[PDB]
Amino acid sequence: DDEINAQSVWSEEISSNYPLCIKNLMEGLKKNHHLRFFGRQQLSLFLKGIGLSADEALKFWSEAFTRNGNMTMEKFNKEFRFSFRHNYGLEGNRINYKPWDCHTILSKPRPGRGDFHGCPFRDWSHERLSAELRSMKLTQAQIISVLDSCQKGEYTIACTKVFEMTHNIAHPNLYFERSRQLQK
């Protein structure tokens, strides 16, 4: 709880370790105060994979869904609380909900309008990727190298390139713990 909790996952320090997909999901949750089923599972199981406790997860999801008066606490407890508790097995279920790897993430149905699951290196446009990479302090030479892998369909190589360029197999939780390891 000292490192990963409901408040510290919104921190810049912790969130600077997220791969592009989790960053995309967190951003959609912050502005819409809600995520769809596929996006819910991708992000929820990742946070569980980095050590977010059951109590902190329910604190995290409840505040996020009810933020800015998006929905009441009663609507959340009646329409979403069970599903999040289900993912941690707090209702007695013994389904093995492991965090999704990149292969599993890319295999899900592709995101449409309003969806935030998936992998940005395949689902975003080159224009959207380029602007996002520039805010991450990448130069156009580095950008053209990442888009090259994207155009070739090697999305895990493009994400591995971003890691090396932003720092000094194929799993989003492996991205986090490698990056978070370089912080300590």
For residue 121, the minimal CB distance to ligand SF4 (Å) is 5
Rg of the chain (C-alpha set): 17
> Among 57, 143, 150, 159, which residue sits at the site for ligand SF4 (rule: CB under 6 A)?
159
- Tell me: does residue 102 bind ligand SF4 (CB under 6 A): yes
Give every CB contact of residue 134 below 8 A, 6+ residues apart in sequence: 143
For residue 80, the minimal CB distance to ligand SF4 (Å) is 24
- Pick the stretch among 31-39, 52-60, 88-96, 119-127 that binds ligand SF4 (CB under 6 A): 119-127
Residues 21-80, interacting with ligand SF4 (CB under 6 A)? 21
- Pick the stretch among 58-66, 70-78, 80-88, 116-124 that binds ligand SF4 (CB under 6 A): 116-124
For residue 77, the minimal CB distance to ligand SF4 (Å) is 31
User: By the 8 A CB rule, do 59 and 6 touch?
Assistant: yes
Around Cβ 161, how many Cβ atoms within 10 Å?
A: 19
**Amino acid identity for residue 59 in this structure:** K
- Tell me: does residue 121 bind ligand SF4 (CB under 6 A): yes
- What DSSP state is assigned to residue 9? G
Give 33-80 as a DSSP string. Answer: S---HHHHHHHHHHHHHTT--HHHHHHHHHHHHSGGGSS-HHHHHHHT
Count of residues touching ligand SF4 (by CB under 6 A): 13
User: By the 8 A CB rule, do 60 and 9 touch?
Assistant: yes
- Tell me: does residue 111 bind ligand SF4 (CB under 6 A): no
Question: How far apart are the C-alpha atoms of 119 and 105, rounded to whole Å?
Answer: 7
> Among 46, 65, 155, 161, which residue sits at the site for ligand SF4 (rule: CB under 6 A)?
155
Q: Which residues in this chain contact ligand SF4 in the complex, by CB under 6 A?
A: 19-21, 102, 105, 119-121, 155-156, 159, 172, 175
